Amino acid sequence: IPLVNDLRFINGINKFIIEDYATHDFSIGHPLNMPSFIPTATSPNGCTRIPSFSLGKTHWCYTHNVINANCKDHTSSNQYISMGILVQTASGYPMFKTLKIQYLSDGLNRKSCSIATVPDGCAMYCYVSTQLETDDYAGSSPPTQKLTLLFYNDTVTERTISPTGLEGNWATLVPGVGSGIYFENKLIFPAYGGVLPNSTLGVKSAREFFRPVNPYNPCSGPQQDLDQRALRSYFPSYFSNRRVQSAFLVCAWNQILVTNCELVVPSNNQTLMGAEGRVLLINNRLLYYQRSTSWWPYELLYEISFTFTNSGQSSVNMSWIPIYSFTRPGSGNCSGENVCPTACVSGVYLDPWPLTPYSHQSGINRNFYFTGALLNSSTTRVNPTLYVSALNNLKVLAPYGNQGLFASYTTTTCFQDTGDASVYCVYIMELASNIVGEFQILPVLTRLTITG
Amino acid sequence: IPLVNDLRFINGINKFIIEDYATHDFSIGHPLNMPSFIPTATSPNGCTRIPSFSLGKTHWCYTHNVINANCKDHTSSNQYISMGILVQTASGYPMFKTLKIQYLSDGLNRKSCSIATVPDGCAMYCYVSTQLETDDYAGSSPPTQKLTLLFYNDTVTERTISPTGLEGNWATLVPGVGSGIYFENKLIFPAYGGVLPNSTLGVKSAREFFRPVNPYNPCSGPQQDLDQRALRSYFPSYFSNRRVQSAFLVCAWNQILVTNCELVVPSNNQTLMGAEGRVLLINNRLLYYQRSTSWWPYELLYEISFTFTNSGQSSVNMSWIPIYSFTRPGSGNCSGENVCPTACVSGVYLDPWPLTPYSHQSGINRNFYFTGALLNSSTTRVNPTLYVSALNNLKVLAPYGNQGLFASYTTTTCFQDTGDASVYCVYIMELASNIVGEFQILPVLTRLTITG
Ligand SMILES: CC(=O)N[C@H]1[C@H](O[C@@H]2[C@H](O[C@]3(C(=O)O)C[C@H](O)[C@@H](NC(C)=O)[C@H]([C@H](O)[C@H](O)CO)O3)[C@@H](O)[C@H](O[C@H]3[C@H](O)[C@@H](O)[C@H](O)O[C@@H]3CO)O[C@@H]2CO)O[C@H](CO)[C@@H](O)[C@@H]1O
Ligand SMILES: CC(=O)N[C@H]1[C@H](O[C@@H]2[C@H](O[C@]3(C(=O)O)C[C@H](O)[C@@H](NC(C)=O)[C@H]([C@H](O)[C@H](O)CO)O3)[C@@H](O)[C@H](O[C@H]3[C@H](O)[C@@H](O)[C@H](O)O[C@@H]3CO)O[C@@H]2CO)O[C@H](CO)[C@@H](O)[C@@H]1O
Ligand SMILES: *[C@@H]1O[C@H](CO)[C@@H](O[C@@H]2O[C@H](CO)[C@@H](O)[C@H](O)[C@H]2NC(C)=O)[C@H](O)[C@H]1NC(C)=O
Ligand SMILES: *[C@@H]1O[C@H](CO)[C@@H](O[C@@H]2O[C@H](CO)[C@@H](O)[C@H](O)[C@H]2NC(C)=O)[C@H](O)[C@H]1NC(C)=O
Ligand SMILES: *[C@@H]1O[C@H](CO)[C@@H](O[C@@H]2O[C@H](CO)[C@@H](O)[C@H](O)[C@H]2NC(C)=O)[C@H](O)[C@H]1NC(C)=O
Ligand SMILES: *[C@@H]1O[C@H](CO)[C@@H](O[C@@H]2O[C@H](CO)[C@@H](O)[C@H](O)[C@H]2NC(C)=O)[C@H](O)[C@H]1NC(C)=O
Ligand SMILES: *[C@@H]1O[C@H](CO)[C@@H](O)[C@H](O)[C@H]1NC(C)=O
Ligand SMILES: *[C@@H]1O[C@H](CO)[C@@H](O)[C@H](O)[C@H]1NC(C)=O
Ligand SMILES: *[C@@H]1O[C@H](CO)[C@@H](O)[C@H](O)[C@H]1NC(C)=O
Ligand SMILES: *[C@@H]1O[C@H](CO)[C@@H](O)[C@H](O)[C@H]1NC(C)=O
Numbered sequence: 001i002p003l004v005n006d007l008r009f010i011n012g013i014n015k016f017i018i019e020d021y022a023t024h025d026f027s028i029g030h031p032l033n034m035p036s037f038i039p040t041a042t043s044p045n046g047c048t049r050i051p052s053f054s055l056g057k058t059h060w061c062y063t064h065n066v067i068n069a070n071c072k073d074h075t076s077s078n079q080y081i082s083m084g085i086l087v088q089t090a091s092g093y094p095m096f097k098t099l100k101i102q103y104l105s106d107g108l109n110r111k112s113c114s115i116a117t118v119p120d121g122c123a124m125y126c127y128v129s130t131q132l133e134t135d136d137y138a139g140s141s142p143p144t145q146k147l148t149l150l151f152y153n154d155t156v157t158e159r160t161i162s163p164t165g166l167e168g169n170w171a172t173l174v175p176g177v178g179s180g181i182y183f184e185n186k187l188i189f190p191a192y193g194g195v196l197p198n199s200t201l202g203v204k205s206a207r208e209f210f211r212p213v214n215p216y217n218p219c220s221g222p223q224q225d226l227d228q229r230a231l232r233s234y235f236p237s238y239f240s241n242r243r244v245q246s247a248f249l250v251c252a253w254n255q256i257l258v259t260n261c262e263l264v265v266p267s268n269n270q271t272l273m274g275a276e277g278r279v280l281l282i283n284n285r286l287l288y289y290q291r292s293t294s295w296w297p298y299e300l301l302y303e304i305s306f307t308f309t310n311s312g313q314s315s316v317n318m319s320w321i322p323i324y325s326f327t328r329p330g331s332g333n334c335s336g337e338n339v340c341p342t343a344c345v346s347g348v349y350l351d352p353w354p355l356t357p358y359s360h361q362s363g364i365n366r367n368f369y370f371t372g373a374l375l376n377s378s379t380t381r382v383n384p385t386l387y388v389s390a391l392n393n394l395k396v397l398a399p400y401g402n403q404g405l406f407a408s409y410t411t412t413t414c415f416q417d418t419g420d421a422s423v424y425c426v427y428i429m430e431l432a433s434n435i436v437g438e439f440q441i442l443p444v445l446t447r448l449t450i451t452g
Numbered sequence: 453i454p455l456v457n458d459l460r461f462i463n464g465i466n467k468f469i470i471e472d473y474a475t476h477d478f479s480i481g482h483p484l485n486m487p488s489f490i491p492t493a494t495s496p497n498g499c500t501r502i503p504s505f506s507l508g509k510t511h512w513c514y515t516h517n518v519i520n521a522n523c524k525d526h527t528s529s530n531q532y533i534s535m536g537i538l539v540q541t542a543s544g545y546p547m548f549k550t551l552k553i554q555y556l557s558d559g560l561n562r563k564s565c566s567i568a569t570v571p572d573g574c575a576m577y578c579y580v581s582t583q584l585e586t587d588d589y590a591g592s593s594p595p596t597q598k599l600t601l602l603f604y605n606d607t608v609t610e611r612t613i614s615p616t617g618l619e620g621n622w623a624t625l626v627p628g629v630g631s632g633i634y635f636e637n638k639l640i641f642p643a644y645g646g647v648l649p650n651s652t653l654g655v656k657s658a659r660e661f662f663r664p665v666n667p668y669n670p671c672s673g674p675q676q677d678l679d680q681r682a683l684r685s686y687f688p689s690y691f692s693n694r695r696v697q698s699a700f701l702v703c704a705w706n707q708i709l710v711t712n713c714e715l716v717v718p719s720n721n722q723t724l725m726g727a728e729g730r731v732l733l734i735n736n737r738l739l740y741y742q743r744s745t746s747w748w749p750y751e752l753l754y755e756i757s758f759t760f761t762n763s764g765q766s767s768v769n770m771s772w773i774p775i776y777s778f779t780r781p782g783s784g785n786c787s788g789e790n791v792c793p794t795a796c797v798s799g800v801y802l803d804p805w806p807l808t809p810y811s812h813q814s815g816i817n818r819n820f821y822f823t824g825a826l827l828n829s830s831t832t833r834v835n836p837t838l839y840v841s842a843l844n845n846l847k848v849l850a851p852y853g854n855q856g857l858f859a860s861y862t863t864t865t866c867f868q869d870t871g872d873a874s875v876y877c878v879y880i881m882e883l884a885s886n887i888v889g890e891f892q893i894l895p896v897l898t899r900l901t902i903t904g
Contacts, residue, residue, distance in 0.1 A: 034493075103487060154453050
């Protein structure tokens with residue numbers, strides 16, 4: 001059995017589904033039933049969390065974390081990894097057929113793992129956690145960074161890596177949880193951590209800040225005061241006042257067995273405080289989702305491009321897509337109602353799937369649409385809701401479950417059946433279950449109907 | 453990857469764990485967390501039901517039924533089948549690692565499927581349902597019988613079979629849901645159906661009946677009247693007064709590609725009204741669990757032996773293990789409190805795993821112990837509870853979840869780690885979930901502690 005999706009999906013993956021630059025109305029279909037490819041816990045109080053999912057052209061890759069005790073405890077953890085294909089069922093829609101499983105269970109607490117689809121298998125970037133995250137940021141040396149390659153021929157290889165730029169500049173670095181991407185002989189993962197303010201990187205970027213403004217809901221104050229507050233928001237005392245920074249782990253695939261990879265650090269003039277994220281490749285255009293862990297509560301998606309120069313002088317440029325639609329839940333001064341620059345470590349991972357390009361060869365598409373699963377609360381991780389969103393407003397909403405259902409991380413991927421033109425979106429959501437532990441991670445497949 | 457369990461379990465499978473014939477105390481451990489090998493539905497109202505599971509010495513086989521609509525809806529169904537191995541984790545206990553998946557999704561409503569572990573794979577016995585079960589029994593011709601072979605080399609073969617004895621004798625025949633067994637070049641599945649009263653088989657067995665009596669809770673009445681009622685209980689008007697009859701589907705494995713198999717029908721002097729069941733092979737001794745679909749509410753386990761004379765006149769002999777411990781839920785006159793012969797189609801599938809032999813070369817072990825999952829109610833499928841039971845009384849109880857949790861079918865298998873002597877029992881239970889459809893089939897693995 002080849003590691004190849006059904007042919008009707010191969011040319012409908014990682015494509016912009018709506019290329020009209022025109023206005024559209026949307027209807028989200030009912031969940032389509034199949035045997036879930038994501039295993040639940042087998043105990044009422046075991047922790048199962050942190051999904052990472054990538055649908056590649058020929059196969060998909062998936063991973064999440066399993067703890068025998070509650071989520072907050074951190075002695076031991078295990079990492080479930082699987083790869084598989086899309087297969088059409090007689091019910092009229094595809095199912096995710098698992099072809100290989102790896103359960104990393106060796107006493108190493110691999111955490112925040114991000115998965116990527118690579119030729120003949122999967123690649124996974126983790127860090128080994130031995131202490132509290134706050135202890136990581138208070139420290140002076142990053143935790144162990146691991147790169148795991150899992151192939152269809154049942155070969156599994158794992159290496160400790162020390163990417164160029166890490167040592168001397170960072171207190172800590174972890175993967176971005178959201179999936180990475182394989183693109184032009186490069187393996188690219190999202191990452192984030194704490195930069196030592198007095199280091200080389202810290203000094204160069206000391207004055208960098210980005211302050212998005214919702215013109216419909218502006219923050220009160222003079223420009224200079226708001227800018228100073230936005231700059232200070234990058235150094236939360238919760239993380240020992242390090243500069244919390246997003247970054248990209250970039251590895252040369254042709255040297256994947258020996259390279260140490262390299263950290264490509266964006267300018268903080270173009271991005272908010274470091275956080276979880278996801279790297280997408282759609283129509284050969286790279287995008288970066290950034291979790292709204294900082295004060296800005298709206299959905300963060302950037303158009304990004306890399307400049308690769310021979311000797312570790314790689315750079316990345318990012319261009320914020322101006323989105324003002326819905327807010328993510330947060331605590332205290334960092335709820336979905338706050339739009340003012342303050343020191344925030346809050347929010348929740350809720351990534352989007354863009355249905356349309358934003359920047360194209362002809363210009364900029366104001367009729368931008370994206371879809372995903374949100375949490376309908378300004379303060380609480382509750383009420384999972386499927387949505388399609390425009391730049392400024394929501395187009396359609398479809399709750400999952402009853403009001404009051406607790407839920408957390410969500411990651412969404414859409415693809416098209418080029419046989420019958422069906423548009424499918426899978427909404428992978430951490431959902432609170434009455435019988436298994438914190439979060440049955442449920443992959444909800446729906447058909448998306450698009451009209452004028 | 454070979455289709456072989458971790459070596460520390462191979463000599464601890466299908467063995468009697470307690471062979472001293474002595475009294476013992478038991479403690480059921482907490483559920484051990486792992487990624488469940490049994491997938492849930494992906495919709496809040498999709499049906500996922502009817503588990504069948506076999507752990508063989510080198511690998512396990514599993515299957516269950518998936519319907520896009522609610523369970524009572526009967527238009528379409530699909531059959532999830534998987535095979536895999538036991539792998540020890542760093543958490544100190546094994547997990548079930550799926551190695552192959554088949555999702556039979558072709559518009560044929562395969563139903564009541566029973567699985568068996570066979571060399572290099574699995575064998576599954578289904579019937580194709582096209583109408584109500586009561587319509588099956590009211591009719592005069594049995595539905596299509598299917599045998600599916602699924603091998604580790606990814607070969608899948610399916611055949612329609614017409615076992616010797618079926619045509620002309622049965623209104624209907626379906627598989628017993630509980631797993632079958634591979635034993636002495638024979639593939640043996642449980643089955644049950646409706647025998648035509650006027651047929652050869654119907655006439656030959658017209659006077660056969662079995663009336664078990666609980667010496668601690670007897671039914672009041674004269675022997676002759678109670679015997680007539682027990683005889684009458686085999687012909688429920690719910691199934692059009694056919695003789696409802698258990699049977700065994702026996703296939704020659706070396707001819708499995710061409711043989712039609714044969715029905716081996718036990719005497720109803722030794723068994724109750726036909727029902728779901730399970731065939732076990734422990735210490736090279738065959739056992740038959742029979743669901744208490746009829747008026748008798750206690751756990752039904754028989755010691756069985758076959759006589760093959762290679763002349764299509766094979767026979768089976770059964771010896772009831774007298775168990776009076778706990779009762780299964782039922783409706784109306786067929787609740788767990790009724791012990792009197794009446795026409796019943798009720799109950800629920802709850803199979804046992806015997807920890808001790810009952811009949812042995814030296815004699816009979818009155819210190820017989822078995823374990824499983826019961827439903828703690830005389831009327832309602834609710835309160836799933838793990839138990840260890842003696843012949844007359846329960847030894848230990850451990851509820852799963854909160855009081856009031858709905859649950860249905862349960863199938864239990866125990867095995868031993870011959871490295872550390874740990875005794876593991878997996879209780880596979882249909883549990884009602886708040887987020888997925890009726891019954892997340894959950895495999896709860898526990899360690900069983902046995903003392904004097
Ligand atoms: C570890 C933990 O407490 N688990 C909670 C979980 O807590 C939430 C935050 O954790 C996660 C998240 O957003 O779910 C999970 C992930 O493992 C974290 N990564 C790492 C490397 O540690 C990730 C990370 O912390 C962020 O991306 C920031 O870099 O976050 C948890 O960090 C957060 O803790 C709060 C704390 O409650 C609060 O008292 C303090 O003031 O600020 C902290 C930082 O915000 O709390 C989150 C929930 O509000 O949440 C789930 C429920 O969704 C619990 O059941 C888990 O046990
Ligand atoms: C099909 C259906 O109604 N599904 C119910 C489910 O119903 C229970 C009985 O069904 C099962 C069982 O025991 O769960 C399911 C299985 O698919 C059946 N097999 C076949 C081949 O049809 C099996 C079978 O019927 C028995 O083994 C007997 O041969 O039984 C269902 O048959 C039963 O129906 C009752 C009926 O409610 C009652 O009005 C009538 O007088 O007698 C019938 C026979 O007892 O009801 C069972 C539940 O009480 O039950 C679940 C809940 O556990 C529902 O959610 C499913 O939708
Ligand atoms: C398993 O698959 C992997 C990846 O497809 C194979 O990896 C490549 O194999 C060639 C051998 O000709 C190597 O020279 C390359 O360096 C490998 N690439 C990577 C990414 O490591 C591997 O050889 C296969 N192992 C087998 C067949 O046992
Ligand atoms: C790097 O990204 C930035 C966005 O942060 C790009 O700057 C924008 O360019 C467009 C079109 O040239 C202008 O309309 C915007 O006003 C610019 N924004 C800012 C803040 O300058 C920039 O062009 C990108 N650089 C490269 C080399 O591609
Ligand atoms: C896959 O495995 C099955 C079972 O091991 C093989 O089935 C055997 O094939 C030979 C055919 O040359 C027959 O003589 C045996 O009777 C078969 N056993 C059964 C139960 O069918 C099958 O050949 C294998 N298929 C492939 C493609 O290698
Ligand atoms: C077949 O099973 C029956 C039980 O239904 C056996 O009958 C029992 O036999 C033992 C020893 O011969 C007696 O102590 C019991 O009293 C018998 N019970 C009944 C109800 O008759 C029978 O022996 C078995 N036959 C064979 C050949 O093993
Ligand atoms: C970032 O913006 C500041 C002004 O806020 C400017 O002084 C600095 O040169 C910019 N750096 C980069 C790399 O854009
Ligand atoms: C949140 O739920 C409320 C129902 O109380 C509804 O009115 C509102 O539209 C929902 N908002 C979102 C963003 O889902
Ligand atoms: C079954 O028992 C009846 C008496 O109730 C007897 O006449 C008949 O011969 C017995 N048949 C068998 C096969 O045991
Ligand atoms: C059932 O639950 C009740 C608690 O209401 C308890 O008293 C009883 O022992 C339980 N029985 C079994 C068999 O679990």
